Design a protein around this ligand. Structure first.
Ligand SMILES: [Ca+2]
Ligand SMILES: [Ca+2]
Ligand SMILES: [Ca+2]
Lengths: 395, 395, 395
């Protein structure tokens, strides 16, 4: 029953066969100290050529070997405050940071690794490797892991890798299309035959129940567009586009930075609690931002970019939320809503309700289905400001 | 396949939402020695104010206490010849007669209690109470029972009742609406797919089977309109409107009495055996009643009121049946047939046949449904003459 | 003679029969430590299932027993600074907090209970219970009370509760409609016959007196719409929608929070003194809010939501007032004004003036009547900011 801003703001394009294709160019350089990954929603995998940044694999440029090694790493997720490695424990895994920040405390907190950093190099070659630092995850993120035994197996498989290892001991264009498959929001509406036969004259309780079902399906559509893992703006956003607040509350400098990272931002999406926190920051700064009109409706905005409330953005137990800045369009590479219309039996242009059967207990079943998905044409179309403290008040 | 006179004689009114409301006024007086009850078909309950006829509760006029006591009695039914209480057995229950006649034989058959009579008064207060008479049920009927322990509990709950009991030891208008809910006659017609594909050219065995199903549903409708307990003229008729024959055979004096009790009687309903018995009585009296025409059809009548045969009126093993005298109409408060038309998929104006599914065994299922009920607007619209001996011949 | 903003801003819907029905869904969960209540204006009652949060009643799920216990609690209101319980006094009542904050000072001020909190648990079972803390009401509110003797009586009534107590010693959907009945603003206008016969040519002192009567009735309508207890936005607002100021003066952060709690707020209602205090806060913060136009009339606003003055909002002796944020509409679930037009004799579309009689003293009497009420379709349609200090000046 709440407002679904993402449903009414995302342009909808018609897919053919319930699938869409987005052509991705992933420019990366070898030797700059940062490993680049390929991200398909929440699943990430290291580019094989970038594996070479690792010294023990520098100048090795055999596609088979690199592809095998890249295929043999395992993705892991870490939460805030979680310890990944402990001092004293023998080192046996190479960890490549794909997202999040990880603080390493030595025997003296050395520093904080970030996206594209590596720790666990020496663990690959020798068995004497021992963790001398404790890695505490300051922020939630992902991490690729290459175990020593698996790498040893890959070495024992390819003679070229063996020879290169024995010898060492003494902008790239990569096109890879991304395929989006339409997801389904489905439900079964069970209407008793008596309710369909009698209560249908002045108002149809069958039609009202169908309306409630459609509203629930639309709410689920919005919740999935925001929070789904495969597709979904919160998770299917580039790791470079995800920013951290400078202080923790959503100060206007953070909004300026969020607008800096991409051209032609269309709007902001945030929880109403987050919008209240942003308003508190505006009042503290002493500035009164203007309000702009979309669709004949006035709405708060920052620098002319409307800020739209979305209750589907999660609030963590630590009372920290996130803000989304996103541009929408097809002619301008942005975020589109993939949806197929012209279904065989449409109650609504995107919907399909079809009679299933009548049970022995005289209960009619209807199948209400809708097909939807989200596509982000270019990486710099959705930016996420994370760890936004929304329970901060003046003191 | 038999004639359904009640289906074709009862006017049919369209209910909204599958429900109807009848406003009942129940005039009763306190202190006339007769307890009045509220009857909703076959379930009966004593009016709380009338409970006061009982001496141990006279002049007590607390609505809460009377309502609780009325709610705490239990309804029981007794058949003819059944013994309710026996001499010598300790008395612990108050019995209020709602219908039927009960002969009490003392240590000398005293008399016969009838509707509104009470026996078991003293059993309420003291534990010494003992049954000194044997109550044999001469006629089937209902009876409300108030146990000593339950009444003691109600006394222990309300201090006002305690004080009134301690002190004693030393036309009313009551509106209460009656709600009628439409009942359903439903069935599933299973037609094999071969029988629906081939045998459909010169005659449809599917359509003929559907016709047989509809006829069976109509027969069930008539049987329920006569014999159902919630609604149904035999049971949902006022206890005052139910009369007993003076002699046992249906003599014309009984028909005159049946016509006496209500104004504008429309017709009589009786079993064909009962009509034969009435004809035998007419021949014995030497009078030849006239026949009147309804719908261009000649029919036997008494005093111009047609007598219609109904085979759905039960015949008891003792060969005793009943006769119904009833007026029909909406403008004149009588008996109406509640029925909702305009169903989503009507084969007939009151019917609804809908395809359910086709089984793995290639059997098509159809759901044939009809919604019906009966309403009696005023109590004096259906009169019943009971215990009519129909196996009596001249000797 | 003052402006009646609520009368001219609330949409008016036509009730049938002088009554309206609002269907309420009350979602509650058992075991989260908070008791949910059902509120009908100013009268509140605990949901029977929620009673189970209490340990001594956990896992007991008998509807009869819970319903009886819920029915047997008594509602009490407490003012600010009022002491409810005192240390040393024996504990005999269970107090469930429905609204307001209550600070408990032990032998060391422990904490402050709020809506949904309970204190007095142990008092239910044993008679040794003694108050060891003093409860001072920091804010006015309501509180449900379950006495030990009443609970003991309920235990002695139901054997199942007895057995469960003996054994222990060793999202839910609840639909319950709310009915609104139209209230009446009525008055009698006494006009002397001489004043009606002579003073009627250039101006009618009868018509001018009638105009004054109508204005007084409209003022009473507004005062009741604001301050009435059964209906009325100040009292008939959800306990969750009532917020407390962070500091006490109406700072813009409080307005942001008030706008946070509900979607599509239409306008604010506050006393002119409260609006002056809000303006003082705006000047202190150094921000100059814009003004928006409603009905071709410019009005102060916050974030584009107009702030309308209402002199009918009470000012407490401690110089603290309240602010109302409310959205109006029927298509969007909000606040509507229930009113029936088409009266038998209308001087104005909502009014009815009818001649009563002429007294022996030659005084004509007229009855001027209007029927009105207010409905809040969903709980999150009226929010109240309470304890707003309006007598604060820069120092
Ligand atoms: Ca690189
Ligand atoms: Ca009586
Ligand atoms: Ca709860």
């Amino acid at each position: 029953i709440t407002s679904r801003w993402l449903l009414r703001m995302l342009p909808w394009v018609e897919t053919k066969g319930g699938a869409y294709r987005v052509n991705r160019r992933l420019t990366f350089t070898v030797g700059d100290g940062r490993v680049e990954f390929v991200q398909d929603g929440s699943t990430v995998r290291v580019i094989p050529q970038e594996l070479g940044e690792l010294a023990l694999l520098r100048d090795f440029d055999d596609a088979e070997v690199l592809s095998a090694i890249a295929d043999r790493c395992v993705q892991r997720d870490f939460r805030a405050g979680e310890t990944l490695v402990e001092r004293g424990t023998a080192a046996d895994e190479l960890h490549l940071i794909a997202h999040g920040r990880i603080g390493q405390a030595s025997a003296v907190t050395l520093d904080v690794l970030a996206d594209g950093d590596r720790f666990g190099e020496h663990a690959l070659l020798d068995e004497d490797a021992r963790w001398s630092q404790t890695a505490t995850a300051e922020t939630s993120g992902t991490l690729l892991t290459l175990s020593r035994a698996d790498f040893a197996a890959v070495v024992a498989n390819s003679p070229a890798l063996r020879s290169h290892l024995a010898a060492f001991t003494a902008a790239d264009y990569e096109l890879k299309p991304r395929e989006y498959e339409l997801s389904v929001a489905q439900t079964i509406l069970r209407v008793h035959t008596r309710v369909a036969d009698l209560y249908n004259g002045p108002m149809n309780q069958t039609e009202e129940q169908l309306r409630l079902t459609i509203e629930a399906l639309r709410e689920r559509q919005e919740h999935e567009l925001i929070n789904n893992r495969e597709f979904g703006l919160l998770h299917n956003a580039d790791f470079k586009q995800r920013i951290q607040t400078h202080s923790g509350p959503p100060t206007p400098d953070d909004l300026d930075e969020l607008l800096c990272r991409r051209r032609g931002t269309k709007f902001f999406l945030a929880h109403p609690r987050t919008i209240a926190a942003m308003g508190r920051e505006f009042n503290a700064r002493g500035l009164y931002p203007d309000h702009t009109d979309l669709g004949g409706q006035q709405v708060p905005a920052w620098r002319g970019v409307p800020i739209l409330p979305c209750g589907k953005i999660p609030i963590t137990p630590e009372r920290t939320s996130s803000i989304l800045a996103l541009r929408t369009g097809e002619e301008d590479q942005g975020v589109i809503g993939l949806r197929q219309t012209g279904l065989p039996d449409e109650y609504e242009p995107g919907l399909s309700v079809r009679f299933m059967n009548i049970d022995e207990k005289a209960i009619i079943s209807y199948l209400v289905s809708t097909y939807y998905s989200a596509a982000i044409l270019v990486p710099d179309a959705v930016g996420v400001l994370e760890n936004v403290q929304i329970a901060n008040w003046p003191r």
